[PDB]
Amino acid sequence: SGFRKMAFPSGKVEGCMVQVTCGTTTLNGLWLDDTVYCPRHVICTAEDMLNPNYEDLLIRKSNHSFLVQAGNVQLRVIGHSMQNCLLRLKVDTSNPKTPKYKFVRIQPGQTFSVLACYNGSPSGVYQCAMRPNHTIKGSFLNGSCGSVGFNIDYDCVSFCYMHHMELPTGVHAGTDLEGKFYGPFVDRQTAQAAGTDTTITLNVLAWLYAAVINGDRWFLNRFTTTLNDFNLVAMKYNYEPLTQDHVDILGPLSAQTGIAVLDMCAALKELLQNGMNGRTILGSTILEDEFTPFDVVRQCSGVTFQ
């Protein structure tokens, strides 16, 4: 029993974090096979960071403008290129600790683990949701750029995020591992506002199913609702519209609890309209939206506490 925001075990990723220095700027790089990936603003000085032209800044560097340190071992750069907002450094050594990996671009509402690192040395692990507005509510200080977000399937690491910047509201923005930003952000030392954000309705629902799987039914009711009538309430409460695909996705959790999706939607509509009346759900006083249906199936028992 229990339900916690749970990261993936970070060991396979720890073995790939390195430190990358260029001039005075130092940040983290990801070392896989014979390549180190890292944010391209490592080649920027304080002057450059406001309005940098990275094509121009980069051609002025050689391979030996870049210092790559893996633990104590210094790694020799033997090639470099720019891929969107990333730099690809080829090094003379292949990382023997490289795991089976893919690069994926996650979709809004999906979750991933973050391995926060400073000077190429892992520091902490936590679980994040890609918000609809393409930000993540991370925990990052100066020096954290190059930290990665990842999921782990069996023994394959799916890298999906590299950290680049912090927005004025304290949330974070970054790229996939091809250097393409999530959301409309750019790597420039300027304030850029997150778009307005929304609650992830599919995740709220998967988590109410987790509560029932773990044996708690107090919030259910006798009513039901149409998709459209639910979506009138969701829009009043700044919840994402529920679609027929999201209903379909909840099929397995609906099956395991015996609670039809639109019945659970009627439960959520009532929770939105009346509040929770000083009660908790899975230990929380608010409706949680950073667990996907995949997260719920992964963590809960396949046997409901009936």
Ligand SMILES: CC(C)C[C@H](NC(=O)/C=C/c1ccccc1)C(=O)N[C@H](C=O)C[C@@H]1CCNC1=O
């Ligand atoms: C050249 C750019 C892309 C670098 C990036 N710059 C920024 O994140 C600037 C953010 C900002 C906030 C308010 C007003 C104006 C700007 C950065 O510092 N990135 C840092 C990576 O090293 C991570 C920051 C540092 C503090 N917490 C973080 O997540």
